[PDB]
Design an enzyme around this catalytic site. Structure first.
Site, short mmCIF file in Angstrom:
data_model
loop_
_atom_site.label_atom_id
_atom_site.label_comp_id
_atom_site.label_asym_id
_atom_site.label_seq_id
_atom_site.Cartn_x
_atom_site.Cartn_y
_atom_site.Cartn_z
N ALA A 166 0.78 -1.25 0.00
CA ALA A 166 0.00 0.00 0.00
C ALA A 166 0.80 1.28 0.00
O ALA A 166 0.51 2.19 -0.79
CB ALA A 166 -0.98 0.02 1.16
N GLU A 167 1.79 1.39 0.88
CA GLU A 167 2.58 2.60 0.90
C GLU A 167 3.30 2.78 -0.47
O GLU A 167 3.30 3.90 -1.02
CB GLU A 167 3.57 2.56 2.07
CG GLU A 167 2.91 2.51 3.43
CD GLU A 167 2.00 3.68 3.67
OE1 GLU A 167 1.85 4.50 2.74
OE2 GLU A 167 1.43 3.79 4.78
N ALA A 168 3.88 1.69 -1.01
CA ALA A 168 4.57 1.74 -2.29
C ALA A 168 3.59 2.11 -3.41
O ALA A 168 3.88 2.88 -4.35
CB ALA A 168 5.19 0.42 -2.58
#
Lengths: 276, 69, 69, 69, 69, 69
Positions: A166-168
């Site tokens: 998700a962060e990526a």
């Protein structure tokens, strides 16, 4: 509703993330350069869940293919994991009523927030390390998990997979940084810098301010500062639609204000202008 | 002290007599607490919701208690 | 002093006796250090996570040590 | 005290005799009130629309009432 | 005074005796200057880089010289 | 007074010898007027462009006239 995330090589990894971004978001032609556009999560046609299948941890033989992550779409909340072996979908406490087709469901004792994952995990994101070794480890931990409790092993395993998925997905900065330990033969390891974390804490506020962008020299939100359009696209790849609690700030309290060619979020401007 | 009015700050006025005025809802209330001037203008700028507390709840009444939300 | 509550500032109240109240977690505490006033409103406005340190760790308790993370 | 000029703040200027000048609309007025300085610079940076009220509504004239919207 | 440490402020802390603490680099340092409190807090809210100068360059050491960059 | 230097504030030094020094353009000028220093800090922190006017337009020179854009 079924996507793949191939961790085989930095190329398969990056190509994977791109497939999912094109599938859930549409380009803002307003913020573009070099054939790369800032994308906005298409939140107009209802919210839904999708599975992301983890593939490629062990590129050699490919055993570790039974991990599947359930992701909410409009805010990209990772609602939990599914052990494809017994098909039990373990979801976080803050999503007690979420269900995924084909699965039975077990609610974990802790919620999804970073505050909780960091308590239970016993570590902080700033300085956190990640490589194929730690990812192979984190897979086995989740796979060998049964039960109700959010154990230190699960929290650490999720801090990691939430970062690389998700962060990526949201930040090209985090993908760029992590990407390279997949092709690095000596097994270095990516270290999540404080700047990387500062980015994650400002997704809502950025998502709110960025569409107000019309060529200012710079954009400042919180501790995050961009010098140009290129500094932006090199950092953010996907934002929320602020036109499952929404990650957008509470309506009309975060407006972008432009002064002398610099675009500010109004909460930041307001907080630093108080001279006593 | 009881709640008089609640809302966003429609606008602020710096007065000739060094007192500060605010418009929250149907009331125009003023305060002569100096250090409240910075706080209110920031509440104003960031669109916070304030609740002015005063027994003098009417146009021109004074106040010294606010709740920032 | 020990850790009392950690979290975002839910709301702040400017009291009549010139003290300042803050709501973090479930406790509602106050301070009389004039300085902490603008510092906490800034904190509340930006969504900073704060740790309030105090022995009086109960609604109504007073404090003076705050960590701004 | 009559309205005089209304608009955004074009620029502000700190003078040799410690007074603060404001350039709004066409008139370019000034003030000897220390507290309006911080407040006015913030107005200028956030783009608020201001209304200066003064009898001396001519370039070079002083003011002391201001509405911040 | 000699350069002691340079970087972003990780956190700040208002202490019991009204002295403010910043953590910059691998060191916690404190100052007794009031006027500096909101400036360092703002340096933290915006990610500004600062240099702290002081002979007491060890944890807990004091300072009164800063360069905002 | 003649304009001396124009640009963003490259850095401010908040001293012990109590003199405040700013770097604007290519010169390093200082000012001792107490309120002018908080204003220049806000200008630095928010990106304002300033013009310092002075006759003492050389490294080390003092000033008291500033325009904020």
């Amino acid at each position: 509703k079924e996507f793949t995330l191939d961790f085989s090589t930095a190329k398969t990894y990056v190509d994977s993330l791109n497939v999912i971004r094109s599938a859930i978001g549409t380009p803002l032609q307003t913020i573009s350069s070099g054939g790369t556009s800032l994308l906005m999560i298409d939140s107009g046609t209802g919210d839904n869940l999708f599975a992301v299948d983890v593939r490629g941890i062990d590129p050699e033989e490919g055993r570790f293919n039974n991990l599947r992550l359930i992701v909410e779409r409009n805010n990209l909340y990772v609602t939990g994991f599914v052990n494809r072996t017994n098909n039990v979908f373990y979801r976080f406490a803050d999503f007690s009523h979420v269900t995924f087709p084909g699965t039975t469901a077990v609610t974990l004792s802790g919620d999804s927030s970073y505050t909780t994952l960091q308590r239970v995990a016993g570590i902080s994101r700033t300085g956190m390390q990640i490589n194929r070794h730690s990812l192979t480890t984190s897979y086995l931990d989740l796979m060998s998990h049964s039960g109700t409790s959010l154990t230190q092993s699960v929290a650490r395993a999720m801090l990691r997979f939430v970062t690389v998925t998700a962060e990526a997905l949201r930040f090209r900065q985090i993908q760029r940084g992590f990407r390279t330990t997949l092709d690095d033969l000596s097994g270095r390891s990516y270290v999540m810098t404080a700047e990387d974390v500062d980015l994650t804490l400002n997704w809502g506020r950025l998502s709110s301010v960025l569409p107000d962008y019309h060529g200012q020299d710079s954009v400042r939100v919180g501790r995050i500062s961009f010098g140009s359009i290129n500094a932006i696209l090199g950092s953010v790849a996907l934002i929320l639609n602020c036109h499952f609690p929404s990650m957008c700030p509470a309506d009309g309290r975060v407006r972008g204000i432009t002064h002398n060619k610099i675009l500010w979020d109004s909460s930041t401007l307001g907080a630093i202008l108080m001279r006593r | 002290t009881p709640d008089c009015v609640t809302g966003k700050v429609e606008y602020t006025k710096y007065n000739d007599d060094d007192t500060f005025t605010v418009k929250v809802g149907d009331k125009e209330l003023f305060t002569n607490r100096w250090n409240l001037q910075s706080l209110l203008l920031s509440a104003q700028i960031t669109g916070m919701t304030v609740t002015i507390k005063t027994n003098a709840c009417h146009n021109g009444g004074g106040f010294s208690e606010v709740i920032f939300r």
